[PDB]
Design a protein around this ligand. Sequence first.
Ligand code: HDD
Ligand code: HDD
Ligand code: HDD
Ligand SMILES: [Ca+2]
Ligand SMILES: [Ca+2]
Ligand SMILES: [Ca+2]
Ligand SMILES: [Ca+2]
Ligand SMILES: [Ca+2]
Ligand SMILES: [Ca+2]
Ligand SMILES: [Ca+2]
Ligand SMILES: [Ca+2]
Ligand SMILES: [Ca+2]
Lengths: 678, 678, 452
Amino acid sequence: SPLAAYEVDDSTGYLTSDVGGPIQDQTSLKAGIRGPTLLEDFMFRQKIQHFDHERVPERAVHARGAGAHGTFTSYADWSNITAASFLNATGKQTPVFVRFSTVAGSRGSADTARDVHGFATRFYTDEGNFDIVGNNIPVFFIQDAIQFPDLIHSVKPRPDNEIPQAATAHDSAWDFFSQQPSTMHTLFWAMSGHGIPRSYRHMDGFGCHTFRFVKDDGSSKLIKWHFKSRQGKASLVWEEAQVLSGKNADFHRQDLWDAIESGNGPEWDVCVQIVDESQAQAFGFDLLDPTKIIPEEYAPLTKLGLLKLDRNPTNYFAETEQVMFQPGHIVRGIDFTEDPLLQGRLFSYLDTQLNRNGGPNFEQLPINMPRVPIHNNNRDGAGQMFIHRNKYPYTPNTLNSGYPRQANQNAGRGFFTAPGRTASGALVREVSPTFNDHWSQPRLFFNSLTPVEQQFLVNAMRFEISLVKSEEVKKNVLTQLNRVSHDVAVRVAAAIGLGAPDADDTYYHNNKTAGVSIVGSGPLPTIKTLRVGILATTSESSALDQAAQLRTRLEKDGLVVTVVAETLREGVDQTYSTADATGFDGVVVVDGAAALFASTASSPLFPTGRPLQIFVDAYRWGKPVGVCGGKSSEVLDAADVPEDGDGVYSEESVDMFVEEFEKGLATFRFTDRFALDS
Amino acid sequence: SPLAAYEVDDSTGYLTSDVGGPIQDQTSLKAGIRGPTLLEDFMFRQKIQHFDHERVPERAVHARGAGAHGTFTSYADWSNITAASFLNATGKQTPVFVRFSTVAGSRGSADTARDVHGFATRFYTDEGNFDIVGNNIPVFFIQDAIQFPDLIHSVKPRPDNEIPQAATAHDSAWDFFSQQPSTMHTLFWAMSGHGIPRSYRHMDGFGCHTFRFVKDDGSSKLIKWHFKSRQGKASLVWEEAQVLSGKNADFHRQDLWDAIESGNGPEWDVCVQIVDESQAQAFGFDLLDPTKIIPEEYAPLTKLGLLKLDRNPTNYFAETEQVMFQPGHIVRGIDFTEDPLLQGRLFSYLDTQLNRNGGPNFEQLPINMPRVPIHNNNRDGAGQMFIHRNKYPYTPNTLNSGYPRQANQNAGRGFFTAPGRTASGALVREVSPTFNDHWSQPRLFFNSLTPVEQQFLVNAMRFEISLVKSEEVKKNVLTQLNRVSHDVAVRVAAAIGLGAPDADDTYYHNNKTAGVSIVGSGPLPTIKTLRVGILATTSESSALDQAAQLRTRLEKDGLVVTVVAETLREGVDQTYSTADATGFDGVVVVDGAAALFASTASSPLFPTGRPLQIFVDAYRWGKPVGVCGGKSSEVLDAADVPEDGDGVYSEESVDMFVEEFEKGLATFRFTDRFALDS
Amino acid sequence: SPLAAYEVDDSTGYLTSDVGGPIQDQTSLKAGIRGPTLLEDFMFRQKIQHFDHERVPERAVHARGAGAHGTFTSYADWSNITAASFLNATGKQTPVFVRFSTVAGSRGSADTARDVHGFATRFYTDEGNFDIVGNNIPVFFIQDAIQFPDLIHSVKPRPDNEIPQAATAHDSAWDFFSQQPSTMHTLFWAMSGHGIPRSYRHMDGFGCHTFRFVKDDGSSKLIKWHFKSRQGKASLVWEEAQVLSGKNADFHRQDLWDAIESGNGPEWDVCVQIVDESQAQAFGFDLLDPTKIIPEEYAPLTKLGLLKLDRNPTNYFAETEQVMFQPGHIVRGIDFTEDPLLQGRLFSYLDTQLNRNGGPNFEQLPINMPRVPIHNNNRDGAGQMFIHRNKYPYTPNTLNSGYPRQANQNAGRGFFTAPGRTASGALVREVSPTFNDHWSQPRLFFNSLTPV
Ligand code: HDD
Ligand code: HDD
Ligand code: HDD
Ligand SMILES: [Ca+2]
Ligand SMILES: [Ca+2]
Ligand SMILES: [Ca+2]
Ligand SMILES: [Ca+2]
Ligand SMILES: [Ca+2]
Ligand SMILES: [Ca+2]
Ligand SMILES: [Ca+2]
Ligand SMILES: [Ca+2]
Ligand SMILES: [Ca+2]
């Protein structure tokens, strides 16, 4: 609907060429009924030419992702800190488009790879398009944009054989990380549950860089952007994420699309940390360094407004694939900082759209068009859609009466550089010594996780580093991890049968910070959209009756209910053959189906043991599990699940069962089921 | 109109980026007032990126050209001969766009090169876009499209040094013509005045190929398209074309522009020759052979409707440079023939737009869009401007209720191949022996020219062949010309110091045909838009009054009058310094200006002898010339122009002078001034 | 090898720009140690421009795949059945490059999706490059190339949300299969273990179409290509393939890489079925119909030679990603048939390389070059890597003494269309009634499987 002017309806009508000539497209024109195809068959060639040219280059990074439309609403008049028009009044609404993504994988790689994630937001403001091109992790691997190809070459597949897909679990990546210590902070985030979010809706967005807010009086403040999920934070566990990558490569895009269609459009508070220009080096690190967070204990979050996604695209290629974000899409009231990573991005995102679009008029694509008039002297170029009436597109002119007029701080609401900004010194290719502590903040992060969260991060490193062939690289990795934490180095080293190097306490400390832990961020604030699998049977009409009664009670509370049985019929959504524990946030067995959980059970309709394996996987991955109806022993014993376990439910009463189970869905994960290093 | 929706008005407002952010664009962002430019200057980079990417590849042929909008109006309901919708009712109006061109020259080459000319017409019909991609010469150089790169390589500049521009006057071209005898018919046309038309408005358009008119009953006839100029046929002379190339490379595009802006938009009758399928070999040649005309004595012209061009473009690049014509843009009621030159064109014009546009969505450019709904399953591609609502773009489908519907002869006004058409025989790379007479029709054409017109054609060949460096190429040319006409070969041979081969009478004949002569086509039917230069002086008030009185007389009759004097002032349009005889169709000297024609005349304000040169050039080139006043003989003596001469006017009276002079403008050229061979 | 000349060694040396100027690439040039980056930093911009432009469009189909180098060796002089030079002597070796693939998935999708698989083989022959662009299933879903976008739109992800990846398990695909009954034969194969082969080495290759072998005397026979695996045939089971998709998306490409690195390079017997022109309709179906096999009981396989893959690429992008196969890459001794699926392929594979390469000189990429001299009047175009010495590139010419000379059946070992080929009848957009049995051969295939 925001792009309704560009929609093409094909719900009626005869087939036409692109120039409106009615045609057919099902049989080639031939010299005789068993003859060769004719070159004069224009119907054939226009259709096949289009098909042959459908593809465009995937994004150089963040190739795998999914988007949606929505609205941003300001909570206040923020004039007192920024001239930004979209923030200038309480309740002011601006249309948005967001794309979420992974980083390393190509198109069609799995959503549930371990990775950094993108969170890119376009505000179609009444003073121009403004993009915040963020990630779900607030810190970046590297401190200078010129290193971006080094990082990305090292994490993408080895270039002789293009193995492995969508993974850091290979020699080159860990060679880079161990040789470039700046990488430690993002690496620890990626190896945490932040690397495998439960959904795009259960992760935050961060600008990463320090930006400026600039008032109409020319004064500036330094900001960090934080988009704080109103769904809660949640993660997968790795051994779930790996199966999910195979069972449903589309899991995150499907979760987002389904949340919007069900009227559960995800929300974020758009927030900033706001500090003075004088505080650039006040917090024990440099605000120009994109490997550092401002601990919330030093600068609290100010809520600016609400971001809500509530409308799926009409055509994925035209809207999601083609959206071309840029940090250069900036508006009056915002400015850059001298963060050398941000600085180089400004070049990269304008240039790379020439590769994707194949020509310079990419801002004319509907998804990239602003929602206000364009007045400039840009002309021509391949794919030019506009027919410009001004035949004097040069400044200064008299023959077009001096239009367009120059916009600046004092006229026409121009963008302007923060006028207090200066530079001084030598023209240098030198790194600021203020950037040199690569280890304190990774230790800050690690210290701020719960004990089983710390175990999960150690286990992710054990997983990946064990797949590194080079004994030299593994030793170098242990040298770097040891500078963050001797305990991490020892525990990782144990899995790969190397010794950790001796403790080096230069950067060790016991400081913690709020709001980085997933396991610690408490029960989810809402269970709406969470997925309940009810394992039933067609062999017992009472099992289907139990499942129907559970469905009614769970759907009332906005849970997405799947009834599973051997075969489809009224009231059954999936077969056992297509069901997997990765498709549910909790699993309920109706006790009328207990016979399908016996070690004897076999059917040509699903793989051997599938009903019990769904229950066992869900338990072993930490999910709420239980048996509804009062006869729980046969199922729980077959699964080796204790009836007294936390997040294990057994009730005759459907109402009592659902009340208990719903508390478990909010807890989301039962971390007592994971072993800890001593 | 898809054009009106994309018009952009910059007559007011502040400068913005392409995403609507107000900006400036006159000073770079620098680290200090004398400092280096910053990479974060997005204003600089988006502007210069656009500039850097303004250009697109020129067309591989017909790169130099100019276009205009207009209307086609049917004279009748032509249902009796064609199903074509745009021809189905008296007075039915269809919008058009026409581009005219040369062939060989690049962009910026001169309009008045000697060349074949394009005349490409798009009919934006209510059943799809229909293009007739024609030339001003009815026959083409070659008989199979596979040879097109051979012809074009040979006539385009030599590929080691890219010399010479926009000319056949070089060894390679005449090597190809002499080795590929099919070329003789078009070569004779290009060496006639048809190679140097006076304007786009003073030439005809030809489809060249035989096409089919197909009725809704499936029956077909064979047709040739003729667009017959209502302005009359007129040529330049070669020496005039050479000077005009230098003095005004834009002569034809300016002539067209100006005629439209003055309310003198050019007109053609869109005509066909119509013959039965049984006549394909009945006229002594094969109607599939694009080197042959149907003599009008065998098949008269039927007038179908009026083509008028009456609106100039708004943006040349967006409309004229980007228009992408295709013979594949066909509509129900028209069909192809098995002409091997037409057959391969169908492939070329779809493919080549990928090169120009850089992507497959070129039909979405406003100038290329149809005027009717588009319904098809073409998707994606770079530059996709649509948002398709049908998420099941495959046939056959049930999920989109079987839409779009297949269109064909029976349903949906589908295009259909003429159902009488067959093929039979071996799959061959063989030329039809019916194509083998390369010489009879060139001789018919030559025989049909007037004596002075024959001399101009011999003189164009003498000019060009004398610049061929290879004695052997020259001999081979004479061999080929001699098979058309011994007299042509003898006369051309005399200029290059070779002997002509002995007469070879195999293809010699004395037959003539109507309607191919320019010199024989009689006075122009209208003198509106023709240019009169009045050569005056600021010295004598009487000269300026004489000029102002002629101006009033002549402008009354729609003549574009230029008063020329030493310097500009009220009533004087042009200085002697910028004036040339190639700027005028007729030249008048006011007798008050006689002093400027003396041999001792000199001025820092114009080159020595300029005023007399303009008069003497106009006279040499055949134009109507005269002295208005009462002295008369002084100027005519200076010019050695005889007062009794045809198209030489001497009148004291402004009224007698103008009545006489305007008859000379209709006669247009006085051919008695050109010497003939003995 | 045109690849040898283009190998670039970076085992030693100082970093340079692409024009050989020694540079650094680790720190941006800034106005002071905490200052903004300068526009004059050419080191930064050349490196980042390259990075920004690394990607090219994935293949419109078969986007997910992997390749290797090897050798074809002829078992005999096959002059008695074809003029093809690569088959004209016992022991004659020809270098090859093969790419294997799925069909529907994008780049990065899993190897072990259920799908049809590509098996595309380039023979760098002494009379030109010859490609056999085949699949692991001998029959195709559709009977006319004009329907290919319909099939592919229906199997690829739904276009509002781009779900699901690399799968036919969705409404649109089964809508198309149920509305277009031609699809049944390939669908049965895709739903068999042939949809989830154990490895690229454990599957066969098929040309699918009937082609022609043409002798120097102009006579022709109808052939089918069969590449028969020496490793045997093997499949995954589905519940295994689904887990493997997640645990190792690269399983087939690693399996191939490892087998070559260990000296276990995979082998196929390159075989044909050979039948007379007069048998086009003799077997109860039409040999022009690409939904039909010739049962081996009616026509046995002749072994022509050995294909072995024994060398991994050096640079996956340069070699595997950029290899551009075409059934139009044909050599003297082979000809097309009037199979309406093959007929349209010939158009598609030449055109689509313009999308992938961005310009017309894609045959100049080292992996696409031939191993004989090129003599033609093709010129210019973006990315022109040749410096042509012939300044008269038109035929007919005298100024280059008539060179290059036309090649044909009687000159220069030219390609020639089989001279017994004819066409008769109306110019029609009509399906042959001989194509109308969509169900018997799917039944034959199903009958031929074991109960499990
Ligand atoms: C110098 C280069 C460079 C650097 C240092 C970064 N990126 Fe970037 N990024 C690109 C160069 C790039 C790119 C090559 O220009 C991409 C590819 C597609 C595109 O439009 O821009 C891109 C895409 C891209 C996308 C996908 C946008 C979409 O969905 O279409 C996100 C979310 C980010 N990046 C986020 C980041 C963040 C949070 C960074 C550090 C704080 C970051 N990038 C550093
Ligand atoms: C096999 C190739 C081939 C052959 C045999 C021809 N042409 Fe052509 N022509 C082209 C290949 C082409 C092209 C390369 O496809 C062009 C370049 C730009 C374009 O759109 O198509 C073209 C452009 C072009 C244009 C310019 C259209 C415009 O103003 O944009 C005209 C008027 C003609 N041609 C006319 C003809 C006529 C009357 C021909 C013979 C009767 C003819 N051409 C044969
Ligand atoms: C009319 C279109 C059309 C039809 C009917 C087919 N294809 Fe195709 N195929 C293409 C259009 C295409 C293409 C769009 O042109 C591709 C994409 C990439 C490329 O080079 O060609 C392609 C790629 C492609 C590849 C990948 C080559 C590589 O690894 O790079 C294989 C193996 C096949 N196809 C095999 C087949 C088989 C065995 C077919 C039927 C018997 C078939 N295709 C029908
Ligand atoms: Ca590696
Ligand atoms: Ca976690
Ligand atoms: Ca030459
Ligand atoms: Ca003339
Ligand atoms: Ca038809
Ligand atoms: Ca679907
Ligand atoms: Ca099997
Ligand atoms: Ca391009
Ligand atoms: Ca042939």
